[PDB]
Write a protein that binds this ligand. Sequence first.
Ligand SMILES: Nc1ncnc2c1ncn2[C@@H]1O[C@H](CSCC[C@H](N)C(=O)O)[C@@H](O)[C@H]1O
Ligand SMILES: Nc1ncnc2c1ncn2[C@@H]1O[C@H](CSCC[C@H](N)C(=O)O)[C@@H](O)[C@H]1O
Lengths: 313, 314
Amino acid sequence: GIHEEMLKDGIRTNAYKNAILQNKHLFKDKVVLDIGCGTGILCLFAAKAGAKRVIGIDMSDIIDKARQIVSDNGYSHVIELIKGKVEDIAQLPFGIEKVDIIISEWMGYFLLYESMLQTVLSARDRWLRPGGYLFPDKCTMYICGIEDSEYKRDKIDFWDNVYGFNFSAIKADALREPLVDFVESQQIITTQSKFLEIDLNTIQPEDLKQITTSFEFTSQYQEYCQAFVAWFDCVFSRGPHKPVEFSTGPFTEGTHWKQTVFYLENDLPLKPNDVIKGTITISQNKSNHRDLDISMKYTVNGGAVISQDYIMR
Amino acid sequence: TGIHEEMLKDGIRTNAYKNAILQNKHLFKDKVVLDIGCGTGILCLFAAKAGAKRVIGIDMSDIIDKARQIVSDNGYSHVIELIKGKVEDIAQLPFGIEKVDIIISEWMGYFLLYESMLQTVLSARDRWLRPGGYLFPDKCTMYICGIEDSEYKRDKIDFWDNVYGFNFSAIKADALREPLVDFVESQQIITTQSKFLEIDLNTIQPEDLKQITTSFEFTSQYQEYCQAFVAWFDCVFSRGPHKPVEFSTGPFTEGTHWKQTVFYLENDLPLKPNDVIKGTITISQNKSNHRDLDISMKYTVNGGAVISQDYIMR
Ligand SMILES: Nc1ncnc2c1ncn2[C@@H]1O[C@H](CSCC[C@H](N)C(=O)O)[C@@H](O)[C@H]1O
Ligand SMILES: Nc1ncnc2c1ncn2[C@@H]1O[C@H](CSCC[C@H](N)C(=O)O)[C@@H](O)[C@H]1O
């Protein structure tokens, strides 16, 4: 079910498609490895671009349907597929020990949740020759404040009266869950703050154990603000002769990632030119490591510190 | 927890249960009530508010903890007792209770039967339900008809012929075997509706569910191509209410969270008005995953040659 959503993600798939096939001279005779190949669509892109040898890794049984897809499209001699977790691979096949390029569809929701980032960097440190390329290599995260009163009454305030009963005991866990959904451009009531940047060319895995950063944006209206919305941008920076990018924000057409919406326990009554400045800290949950802890502490006009904690479960 | 928000925001479903219970307070008053898969306890609260003397909720997930608080918060701790565990693992009901007067359960799965709690409801009925007790709800019937759905068949099935210039037809086979759980507009229905299954939880034996064999018949009303069949189930709170309560999950009423189940035809049927599509459906537990649903169809158009298709709901 995943790969239909992936392949129907036009904005996503076309970005990878353009960055690969629009630099055929770059790819020709290179050895390419594709972390999480799935149906093999990107392996097919690299092979079509001219790669001499392509390796796909994938842990599910989708590896089987991919072999057939690749055999059907006449690249079985070029594209070699391995079933398994990257972390279980003794050696790449055929005694290959270095690769020229690493391809991965690794970005999760909120970029980092259930992402393969920690896997890509492991394949990068094990196999990527000095100066190799990563498609993609650079991500920046943004955030801003929105007016979203209709949805906050519906997903948050709803538990105060459920068929006449008082279900407020759930209200806390509703606020703790960030919402993955689409936000309309009209709802934004502030400027946008860039609060994180990952460069897979240089970022070291240790620098991900706990991420500490901050954000700043200014309100433009006298308005109550009920949530913050984050999203990430992607660049195939190094490799193409002109850069390729796609966004997951609300100013362009949607991707399957949507946006991430973070509900404020108390609405901030903002006035124009109010300065919202704050700290975000992001780390893997202590108990279930596939969960994402995200803590926020912020102020409005250097005022008292509002703090909220979120778990992406 | 994502399940229970979805369940509770399903208005058509929750109000049917709300109506079947609170509209018979004289029936429920002083009864002992059992709730299979109580969740947040909303139905227990319906039962307690209805006048029940004792309500018991069973649930295997940890949501039972939040339900304890919700019950205490709405002032029913003395009525409603909650137990954590699988119903099939409960040694005895609490307090030395050995029989109950009413069983409430939200058990219906997708396509009514896929990953349904039906066989759990039935052990709880055979273990604890007094002779002549009530099951909320007790009778479900399934319907089927044929639709015009060419735009979505081109998009969900024909998509695999060329994805970004490559040939992905190897995916096509498994795409057709997977029934689509989704909403279909009534406007697309091009045939009469065939009722092809009926379950009465008062009398059905669990064994009679391992393999269900039945049939269906519906008539085309238009000159039109038909690309899929759509099935759905209705629910009735038959015995207990003095005027019956029901809700549907079909495309002529408001949507519920179950939506509809769509069965794509490998070959489109060019139908004419008054064509008769008649067939056998058989539904059985998959051999490899027992929680997977095998669904087999063999049918004709005007008694012509037998078209047959097989599906797995995984
Ligand atoms: N640690 C790991 N080792 C090997 N494969 C992994 C993995 N973690 C995730 N995967 C695989 O990565 C895939 C990500 S989906 C992306 C598929 C493909 N690159 C495309 O764009 O269409 C999943 O199919 C999953 O099976
Ligand atoms: N074998 C089993 N034993 C106990 N609880 C079960 C069970 N199988 C499913 N359940 C529970 O049944 C619930 C069904 S969801 C329905 C919740 C509630 N009755 C409502 O309508 O709002 C789930 O919470 C699940 O935890």
